[PDB]
Design an enzyme around this catalytic site. Sequence first.
Site, PDB file in Angstrom:
ATOM      1  N   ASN A   1       0.412   7.493   2.719  1.00 36.69           N
ATOM      2  CA  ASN A   1       0.911   6.489   3.648  1.00 36.69           C
ATOM      3  C   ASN A   1       2.378   6.702   4.001  1.00 36.69           C
ATOM      4  O   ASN A   1       3.038   5.778   4.483  1.00 36.69           O
ATOM      5  CB  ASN A   1       0.700   5.092   3.065  1.00 36.69           C
ATOM      6  CG  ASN A   1      -0.766   4.742   2.918  1.00 36.69           C
ATOM      7  OD1 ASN A   1      -1.614   5.256   3.648  1.00 36.69           O
ATOM      8  ND2 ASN A   1      -1.073   3.864   1.974  1.00 36.69           N
TER       9      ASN A   1
ATOM     10  N   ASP B   1       0.837  -1.194   0.000  1.00 43.55           N
ATOM     11  CA  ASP B   1       0.000   0.000   0.000  1.00 43.55           C
ATOM     12  C   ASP B   1       0.879   1.253   0.000  1.00 43.55           C
ATOM     13  O   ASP B   1       0.694   2.167   0.804  1.00 43.55           O
ATOM     14  CB  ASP B   1      -0.958  -0.033   1.193  1.00 43.55           C
ATOM     15  CG  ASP B   1      -2.045   1.025   1.113  1.00 43.55           C
ATOM     16  OD1 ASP B   1      -2.353   1.483  -0.005  1.00 43.55           O
ATOM     17  OD2 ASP B   1      -2.595   1.393   2.174  1.00 43.55           O
TER      18      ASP B   1
ATOM     19  N   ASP C   1       2.164   3.027   7.164  1.00 42.56           N
ATOM     20  CA  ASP C   1       0.979   2.241   6.812  1.00 42.56           C
ATOM     21  C   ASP C   1       1.341   0.782   6.535  1.00 42.56           C
ATOM     22  O   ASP C   1       0.857   0.172   5.580  1.00 42.56           O
ATOM     23  CB  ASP C   1       0.248   2.863   5.621  1.00 42.56           C
ATOM     24  CG  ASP C   1      -1.134   2.278   5.404  1.00 42.56           C
ATOM     25  OD1 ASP C   1      -2.071   2.657   6.135  1.00 42.56           O
ATOM     26  OD2 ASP C   1      -1.281   1.442   4.488  1.00 42.56           O
TER      27      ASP C   1
END
Length: 302
Positions: A167, A162, A180
């Site tokens: 993030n 991700d 993240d």
Amino acid sequence: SDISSPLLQNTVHIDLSALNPELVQAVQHVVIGPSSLIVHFNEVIGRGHFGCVYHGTLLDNDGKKIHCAVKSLNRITDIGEVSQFLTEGIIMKDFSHPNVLSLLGICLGSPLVVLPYMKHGDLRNFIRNETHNPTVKDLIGFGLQVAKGMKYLASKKFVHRDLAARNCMLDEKFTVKVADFGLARDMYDKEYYSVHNKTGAKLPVKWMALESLQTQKFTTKSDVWSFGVLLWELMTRGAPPYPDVNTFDITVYLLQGRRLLQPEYCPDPLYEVMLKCWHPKAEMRPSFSELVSRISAIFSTF
Ligand SMILES: Cn1cc2cc(C(F)(F)c3nnc4ccc(-c5cnn(C6CC6)c5)nn34)c(F)cc2n1
């Protein structure tokens, strides 16, 4: 000796009875004493799908008060899914890199994820703030820093899954940390995620590689894809990717061979790097150690 006053290392056994023995020892190495951390539940500095993030005060070997964000896991209710979550990401304790979000400890209804405080928030909200003036060279430096931490995570055979400008966080020295992941993995902006309806998997379609949408088998080559989209956000200073393409026909866009267009203020050698990361053959995309070679040469020169 007692039910009421057990030693700290044993409270892993008590309050985490649904954990692997292997994992009992893993989170035993990273326990935080409650008398060593004050959690300010007065103001939330972050909201995720597993719980909120609060300002904290960690106390170390000396009285020194180090600021922190403490991730709460109150909303994940099943105390067996919690154990699964600690299974997924406790390997974060082995990671140590200046461009990677580190983990300070786990405190103790759900446990507490104690993480370093990030003075400037996430990478996207920073580059989108009207009142902030990053030059072209600055934003490329940010993309340089994430490439290094990614290169570090890639060396651990670790697939973050991700990578995106929402993030990655910024401390008070504007060091970018990939975040993240692991105990910090969550959905900090739900708008961009599709929940698969057979696998519970959470899918950032605008950042996923083409093979990832067709198979849901994430790899180290698929983060290279997500990294060039990350380059794209930076050069557009946080613009949404594919505003003319909703999630459904995103596969049709990428199976045609169409990619994201060159932003107005992205140098041609940097946009060429973006196109290599989006190569339809994953094995032919640039590695993160080759990415750090190309981006540095672009970051120094004009
Ligand atoms: C001041 N501070 C807040 C913090 C939050 C975390 C965190 F929550 F645990 C965290 N870990 N990885 C991530 C990745 C993205 C975000 C995130 C949060 N908001 N956003 C914007 C809405 C999209 C992205 N958080 N995050 C942290 F480790 C340190 C922090 N310091």
